[PDB]
Design brief:
mainly alpha; Recoverin, domain 1; binds ligand CZB; EF-hand-dom_pair; disulfide bond; metal-binding; EF_hand_dom; Aequorin-2
Length: 187
C-alpha cells in the first residue's frame, strides 16, 4: 500500500505507456485522445452497446482525469508523470480505506463488455481480444504471462477483483509479486 515514485522502473513503466499513448510522437497527449481511443476500442472492436460504451468512457475520463489530464489540454511528459504521482497516491488511499478505486471502476466497465457472460471475469481469449485491440500487448505469449502472474479462478478466468489487486502492484507500487503482468509488452 506504499508507493515507490523514485524507482527508475516505476518512472520507466509509465514513460513506456506515455510513449505508447503518444502514437504520433507529439511529446504530449490530451484527455480527448484518451477517451477517443477508449471508445474506439470498445465500440469498433469489442462489440459494446451504447450504454456500455458511455459507462466505459466515463471511467476512462475519470481515470486520466485523476492524473491531471483535461479536455483541450496537451499534457507533456513532466506534467504526465507528476499527475501520475497524484493518481497513484489517491488510488492507494482509497484502496486502504476499502473505497472503490478509479482503476476498479474502469475494470468493471471494461469487463462488462469483454466478459461474454457479464459476471466480472474473462477468459484468456477475451484478454487477448482486448489487449491486442488496445495494442497494450501484441503477442499471445505475453497475454499468456498475465494468466501466469494472476491468481486464476476455478473456471480458468481472471476476475476483476484479482486484476485490480495486480494493477495496484503493477501500476502504483512496484510490488515484486506483480512483475511481468503484461509479459514482455510493458517493462
Ligand atoms: O489496466 C489497463 N490499462 C492501463 C493503461 C495505462 C496507461 C498509461 C499509464 O501510464 C498507466 C496505465 N492503459 C490501458 C490501455 C488504454 C489506455 C487508454 C485508453 C484505452 C485503453 C489499460 N487497459 C487496461 C484496462 C483495465 C483496467 C482496469 C482493470 Br481491473 C483491468 C483492465 O488493461 O490493459
Amino acid at each position: 500500500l506504499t508507493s515507490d515514485f523514485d524507482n527508475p522502473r516505476w518512472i520507466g513503466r509509465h514513460k513506456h505507456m506515455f510513449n505508447f499513448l503518444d502514437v504520433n510522437h507529439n511529446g504530449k497527449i490530451s484527455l480527448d485522445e484518451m477517451v477517443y481511443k477508449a471508445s474506439d476500442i470498445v465500440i469498433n472492436n469489442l462489440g459494446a452497446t451504447p450504454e456500455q460504451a458511455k459507462r466505459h468512457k466515463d471511467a476512462v475520463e475519470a481515470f486520466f482525469g485523476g492524473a491531471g489530464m483535461k479536455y483541450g489540454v496537451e499534457t507533456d511528459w513532466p506534467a504526465y508523470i507528476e499527475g501520475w504521482k497524484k493518481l497513484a497516491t489517491d488510488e492507494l488511499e482509497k484502496y486502504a480505506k476499502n473505497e472503490p478505486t478509479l482503476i476498479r471502476i474502469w475494470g468493471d466497465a471494461l469487463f462488462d463488455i469483454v466478459d461474454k457472460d457479464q459476471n466480472g471475469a474473462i477468459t484468456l481469449d477475451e484478454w487477448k481480444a482486448y489487449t491486442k485491440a488496445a495494442g497494450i500487448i501484441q503477442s499471445s505469449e505475453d497475454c499468456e504471462e498475465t494468466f501466469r502472474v494472476c491468481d486464476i479462478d476455478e473456471s480458468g478466468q481472471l476476475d476483476v477483483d484479482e486484476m485490480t489487486r495486480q494493477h495496484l502492484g503493477f501500476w502504483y507500487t512496484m510490488d515484486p509479486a506483480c512483475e511481468k503482468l503484461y509479459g514482455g509488452a510493458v517493462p
